[PDB]
């Protein structure tokens, strides 16, 4: 309208947007900093970065932008381009890239009292450290630090934003249900806001927004844990196979192949920080070592099975332990021509008797192998069950605190 033209011409005749609006030398400008989270895009753990789509709810007072609406056909407020007015250089300090400022410069709202309101949108990439110990059953604590890049506490005073009907401060990130997309991998547990100072530096003050988010581990659960459990079952099973099948090594070493394939699968998903080992990687390594020990003990059982008196002499301690003692505990419990012909028959009988004795000793060795194999089966079953149960309860007892502490 024409009256808007006249009002704008009057307001910005000598208005300098480079000058902070201070009635008197020494005054501080109160700036209220609020945040509206529209979308928690990503929390890339490989680079330790959070991407969010946010609004900054900024509000302050500019005494120069004051007019009496009765003199201008009752114009109570104006929509002025944001570059034409002074603004505090409120930026995201802990950004991972070099982009400190907002992305979209929506025009400001100026009221006839001089109260200026600005709600720019931005795509922010802040940097938050990842606690890689219970990954992927982990909760992260990612912050967004907002303050004026230029002005300090002697020039501006940061405050929390006010609610819709401004009566008391909002000490949380605002989420509008009309425009908010659930991440699908992260659940927002707490979203408090707090102002932070520094004891050493008295001119510092910021408004930090904290996002306590818990991961949903279903993808990792399926794609790593279920195959790992199946491979552990195979590692236990290798001890139920008879040594005569000639298949123990195939099973155990192919289980090792599967474990290293799953390691290849998981390599491109775990963060590369060295402060701790994620519980998933610990579980993979425990499964790998269990499969390696299954291979080792399968080799031992095969070696015991294929022994004979022609090669080995059975010691007394092995006989005492594996034949006398363990099986009850493991429930096993096992004319010239006539003379020539007579000599030939006698020789054949002696050969059969010697072969029978040899076979009996071989059966003793094979029985020792069987008993040891059953012992390994029970021991590995117990160890695998206890280890997997311990790791799963350790992971499942990891919960974000009830009090955000912020």
């Amino acid at each position: 309208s024409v009256m808007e033209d006249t009002l704008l011409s009057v307001l910005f005749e000598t208005y300098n947007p480079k000058v902070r609006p201070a009635q008197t030398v020494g005054d501080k400008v109160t700036v209220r900093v609020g945040l509206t989270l529209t979308n928690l895009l990503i929390l890339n753990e490989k680079i330790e970065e959070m991407t969010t789509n946010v609004f900054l709810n900024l509000a302050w007072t500019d005494y120069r932008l004051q007019w009496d609406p009765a003199a201008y056909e009752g114009i109570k407020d104006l929509r002025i381009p944001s570059s034409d007015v002074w603004q505090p250089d409120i930026v995201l300090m802990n950004n991972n890239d070099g982009s400190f400022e907002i992305t979209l410069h929506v025009n400001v709202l100026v009221q006839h009292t001089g109260a200026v309101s600005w709600q720019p949108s931005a795509i922010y990439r802040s940097s938050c450290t990842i606690k890689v110990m219970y990954f992927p059953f982990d909760w992260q604590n990612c912050t967004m630090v907002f303050k004026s890049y230029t002005y300090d506490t002697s020039e501006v005073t940061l405050q929390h934003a006010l609610d819709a009907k401004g009566e008391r401060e909002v000490k949380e990130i605002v989420i509008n249900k009309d425009a908010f997309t659930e991440n699908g991998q992260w659940s927002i547990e707490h979203k408090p806001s707090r102002k932070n100072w520094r004891s050493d530096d008295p001119s510092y003050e910021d408004v930090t927004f904290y996002l306590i988010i818990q991961r949903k581990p279903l993808f990792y659960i399926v794609y790593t844990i279920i195959p790992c459990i199946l491979i552990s079952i195979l590692a236990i099973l290798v001890f139920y196979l008879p040594p005569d099948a000639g298949e123990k090594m195939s099973l155990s070493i192919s289980a090792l192949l599967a474990v290293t394939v799953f390691l290849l699968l998981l390599a491109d998903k775990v963060p590369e920080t060295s402060l701790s080992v994620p519980i998933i990687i610990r579980y993979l390594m425990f499964i790998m070592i269990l499969v390696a020990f299954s291979v080792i003990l399968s080799v031992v059982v095969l070696n015991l099975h294929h022994r004979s008196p022609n090669t080995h002499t059975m010691p007394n301690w092995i006989r005492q332990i594996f034949i006398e003692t363990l099986p009850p505990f493991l429930w096993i419990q096992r004319p010239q021509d006539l003379k020539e012909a007579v000599e030939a028959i006698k020789y054949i009988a002696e050969q059969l008797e010697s072969a029978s004795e040899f076979d009996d000793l071989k059966k003793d060795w094979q029985y020792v192998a069987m008993v040891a194999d059953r012992l390994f089966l029970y021991v590995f079953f117990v160890i695998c069950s206890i280890g997997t149960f311990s790791i799963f309860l350790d992971a499942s007892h990891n919960v974000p605190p009830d009090n955000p502490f912020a």
Binding site: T14, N16, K18, V19, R20, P21, Q23, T24, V25, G26, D89, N96, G98, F100, S127, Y149, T150, Y151, E155, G246, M249, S250, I253, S254, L256, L257, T260, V261, L263, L264, A267, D268, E272, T273, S274, L275, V277, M285, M288, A292, V295, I296, V299, N303, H306, R307, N310, T311, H312, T313, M314, P315, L338, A341, E343, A344, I345, Y347, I348, Q351
Partner: protein, 395 residues
């Protein structure tokens, strides 16, 4: 503020930001440059680029921008956009692929005496020699060289704010530990003329890699595969599975080679420690397979076509088993019927002789397996200790 409005109006009225801020053209601007390290974003071993988030603090006096506070209501400090005044063109000389100069023109603090404080932010991507020789237990020394691009030292002089970069607000990297850091100023002269110094300030950071991720994710499976390829020699040949075990260990090592190439840097300047250990593991597995083939061949040695050499019998049957203390190894028609019985007896005789010779061959192969099991366990331990112990003791 109307006072500040009038001050800003009168303070840039005849200010040319092209001109140096010196009273006389023979003077020099003294700029105090200080570097503040906020975050170590990444170290790219392949391309030899270090990415850091820094604040480049700069201080200098501009006589043209001074005012008397008493004439403007007692104002002593104002904030001005940095693009309104003369600025030093500081350039990161060893910039790899980032910005050469400051691109974020943040506001600067101007004091009534003309003293200016400008602290723009920057992302420095600086080129530095990466030494992958003790990877992942490697220490890197990567530097940042700063200087005025177009002025010599007689026109614009830069001096360090302190002898060390400011890491007061540094963020813990999680991959690197900051051993040491310092800043040095250099005077460089040329054959032209020794009265024209060229100044640069170099900040260097000693970085020690935290070798937990790479150890767990690479070295441990290699240790496992070395142990298994050693173990293959305790497997009896009668169980027709020596080849299965050895070649499947090789296949697992190949899949893990895929993983390793995915993880470790692809540099070619030098062989890293992990590269050496991977190659050693590969050669170990290959030698294991070859010697297993030799043993399998010896075990299935036909007595009909082969006769045992005397020296083999003397060595592997007589002397070696005696020194293996821990082992448990041994140290009408009636005429036709009579003729048939005699034939059966003599065939049993021949079969017994052949079986005895074959069992001797099998015993020799088994003794060779015992020797090789001991030797390969020793080699695995010695090689694993030797490859890493020098660096581990060095730390």
């Amino acid at each position: 503020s109307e006072h500040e409005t009038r001050l800003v109006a009168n303070l840039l009225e005849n200010y040319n930001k092209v001109i140096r801020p010196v009273e006389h053209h023979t003077h020099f601007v003294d700029i105090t440059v200080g570097l503040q390290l906020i975050q170590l974003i990444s170290v790219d071993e392949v391309n030899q680029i270090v990415e850091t988030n820094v604040r480049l603090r700069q201080q200098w006096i501009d006589v043209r921008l001074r005012w008397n506070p008493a004439d403007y209501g007692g104002i002593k400090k104002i904030r001005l956009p940095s693009d309104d005044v003369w600025l030093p063109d500081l350039v990161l000389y060893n910039n790899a692929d980032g910005d050469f100069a400051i691109v974020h023109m943040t506001k600067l603090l101007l004091d009534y005496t003309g003293k200016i404080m400008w602290t723009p932010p920057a992302i420095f991507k600086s080129y530095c020699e990466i030494i992958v020789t003790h990877f992942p237990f490697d220490q890197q020394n990567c530097t940042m060289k700063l200087g005025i691009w177009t002025y010599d030292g007689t026109k614009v002089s830069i001096s360090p704010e302190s002898d060390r970069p400011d890491l007061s607000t540094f963020m813990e990297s999680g991959e690197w530990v900051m051993k040491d850091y310092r800043g040095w100023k250099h005077w460089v002269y040329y054959t032209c003329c020794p009265d024209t110094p060229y100044l640069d300030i170099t900040y260097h950071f000693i970085m020690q890699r935290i070798p937990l991720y790479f150890v767990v994710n690479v070295i441990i499976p290699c240790l496992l595969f070395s142990f298994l390829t050693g173990l293959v020699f305790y497997l009896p040949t009668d169980s027709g599975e020596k080849m299965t075990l050895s070649i499947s260990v090789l296949l697992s090592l190949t899949v893990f080679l895929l993983v390793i190439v995915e993880l470790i840097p692809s540099t070619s300047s030098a062989v890293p420690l992990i590269g050496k250990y991977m190659l050693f593991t590969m050669i170990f597995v290959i030698s294991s397979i070859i010697i297993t083939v030799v043993v399998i061949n010896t075990h299935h040695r036909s007595p009909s076509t082969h006769t045992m050499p005397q020296w083999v019998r003397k060595i592997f049957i007589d002397t070696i088993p005696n020194v293996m203390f821990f082992s448990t190894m041994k140290r009408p028609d009636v005429k036709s019927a009579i003729e048939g019985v005699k034939y059966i007896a003599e065939h049993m005789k021949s079969d017994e002789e052949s079986s005895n010779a074959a069992e001797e061959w099998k015993y020799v192969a088994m003794v060779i397996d015992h020797i090789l099991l001991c030797v390969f366990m020793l080699i695995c331990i010695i090689g694993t200790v030797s490859v890493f112990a020098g660096r581990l003791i060095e730390l």
